[PDB]
Design an enzyme around this catalytic site. Structure first.
Site, PDB file in Angstrom:
ATOM      1  N   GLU A   1      40.972  42.334  41.819  1.00 25.77           N
ATOM      2  CA  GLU A   1      41.537  42.010  40.847  1.00 25.77           C
ATOM      3  C   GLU A   1      40.728  41.855  39.758  1.00 25.77           C
ATOM      4  OE1 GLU A   1      41.643  37.841  41.751  1.00 25.77           O
ATOM      5  OE2 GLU A   1      43.945  37.648  41.516  1.00 25.77           O
TER       6      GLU A   1
ATOM      7  N   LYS B   1      51.481  39.413  41.424  1.00 19.81           N
ATOM      8  CA  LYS B   1      51.485  38.817  42.612  1.00 19.81           C
ATOM      9  C   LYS B   1      52.071  37.487  42.798  1.00 19.81           C
ATOM     10  CE  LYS B   1      46.508  36.021  42.129  1.00 19.81           C
ATOM     11  NZ  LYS B   1      45.699  35.436  42.050  1.00 19.81           N
TER      12      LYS B   1
ATOM     13  N   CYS C   1      44.390  38.536  46.561  1.00 16.23           N
ATOM     14  CA  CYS C   1      44.232  37.042  46.364  1.00 16.23           C
ATOM     15  C   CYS C   1      44.487  36.580  46.889  1.00 16.23           C
ATOM     16  CB  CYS C   1      43.296  36.669  44.530  1.00 16.23           C
ATOM     17  SG  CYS C   1      41.924  35.822  44.978  1.00 16.23           S
TER      18      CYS C   1
END
Lengths: 274, 274
Positions: free
Chosen positions: B43, B112, B153
């Site tokens: 990330e 994301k 994440c």
């Protein structure tokens, strides 16, 4: 009303039903004496676990076993999660968790939804569905502290069940169950930690004590996990009563700190119950 | 094509984008030299992670960073999961994982979906939505070995994303991401093991290396987990390339031994997707 005491009875199960019932009820009374508000017995607590046993130990509900559970819940003024027992109904057999309230009333009956059908070569082969039939309902009950959702053993492998319970407002999930010497080290703790952390709920498992001579050798290790995924307490393999004081204020705080239940993307996905 | 080699580049990230890109691309070449078929960066691999950094390091796609990733995937003949970078598009900023195939083609780009908005008192407060906007699509790509699904994440906290990817045939899920010194020990391993065991897939996480002087201190510990929930390999905190040979025959055997994907009760629940 923000904290209550949960007791998990990790019962040693024998081949004599009345022996199991006598000892189960005396341990429930002890748990109540030590301040438990909710008490759980383990999976198949009244009889040996196995497909050739279920038909002969099965009872209708109400029957011998549930009448004793009802009476002890009433006399102890607790919520009693009756582990599970083999249940007969209309020519079918089920693996059934009956829950009784502090007045002795049946609050809910959970028939195991996902039957224990696995085959791990050289380790464990079990086909619960060859004698038992699956349940077809979600099972919750209310207490003054919170709503509780139920699964039995293999049900713990199905994330969707816990997702639906969390949607419906459950703050504690209880899974009576016995993993074994293969699935226990691999999966028992992982699965209950997953259910807890993903849904931000307390999760408890009630296992029988290990008997190395039984046909199915129970892992043991009844456990309570908090909404952070932290193990709060964990039994050994022997018979015991495991106590935990379930702090629902802590749950509320966790749900604010990492607020995943409020961050779900309902425009992209949903878990639907039918 | 039942086994392939996955490499996770646990890159130390600096404040100088071109430095990150130079070192990222050299490590990708090294991974390919050692036989990796799929390589993942972590990330925000090209710039420091933080809301006041994203606007200034953001790029359009294609741009400086994705052009370098495309070129190196081409020249190394690999599938390259481009960690994530801050992406600008139409006045909005995203946290974006771009994937390039062995011909340098963009296969998919994952913005994301669930932004990192948490507040753990005394420990970590982050509000990714201060500056970033969320993605609105599921992201998979195909290789000759299997289909791969993507999250970044905080996406790993949302079980439904992995459930949908498993439904769609994914056998490996990759989550570039950096947990921190609080969420790392509590949740990093648990979450990836949960995604793996519940969906019977391989799961890999690609974290940057820890920099104790960064504003956001990465946990590290890039990890690969198998469908049994077993950690196959795990990095430390330092910069490294982590390799794992992903055995899809093992996945198939696990899915037969404990066949939970075949035992779902679609009459009771479903995970529905857009």
């Amino acid at each position: 009303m923000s904290t209550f005491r949960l007791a998990l009875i990790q019962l040693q199960v024998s081949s004599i039903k009345s022996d199991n019932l006598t000892r189960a009820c005396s341990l429930v009374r002890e748990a109540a004496k030590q301040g438990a508000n909710i008490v759980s017995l383990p999976e198949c607590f009244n009889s040996p676990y196995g497909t050739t046993y279920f038909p002969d130990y099965a009872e209708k509900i109400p029957g011998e076993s549930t009448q004793k559970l009802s009476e002890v819940a009433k006399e102890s003024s607790i919520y009693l999660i009756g582990g599970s027992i083999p249940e007969e109904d209309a020519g079918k057999l089920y693996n059934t968790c009956s829950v009784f309230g502090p007045d002795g009333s049946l609050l809910v009956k959970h028939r195991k939804i996902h039957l224990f059908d696995i085959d791990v070569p050289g380790k464990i082969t079990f086909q619960e569905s060859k004698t038992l039939s699956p349940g077809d309902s979600f099972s919750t009950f209310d207490t003054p502290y919170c709503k509780v959702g139920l699964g039995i053993c293999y049900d713990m492998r199905f994330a969707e069940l816990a997702q639906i319970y969390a949607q419906r407002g459950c703050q504690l999930l209880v899974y009576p169950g016995a993993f074994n010497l293969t699935t226990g080290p691999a999966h028992w703790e992982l699965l209950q930690r997953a259910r807890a952390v993903d849904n931000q709920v307390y999760v408890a498992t009630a296992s029988p004590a290990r008997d190395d001579k039984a046909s199915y050798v129970a892992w043991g290790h009844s456990t309570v996990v908090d909404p952070w995924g932290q193990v709060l307490t964990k039994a050994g393999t022997e018979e015991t009563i495991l106590y935990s004081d379930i702090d629902l204020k802590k749950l509320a705080e966790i749900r604010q700190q990492i607020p995943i239940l409020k961050q779900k993307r309902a425009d992209l996905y949903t878990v639907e119950s039918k």
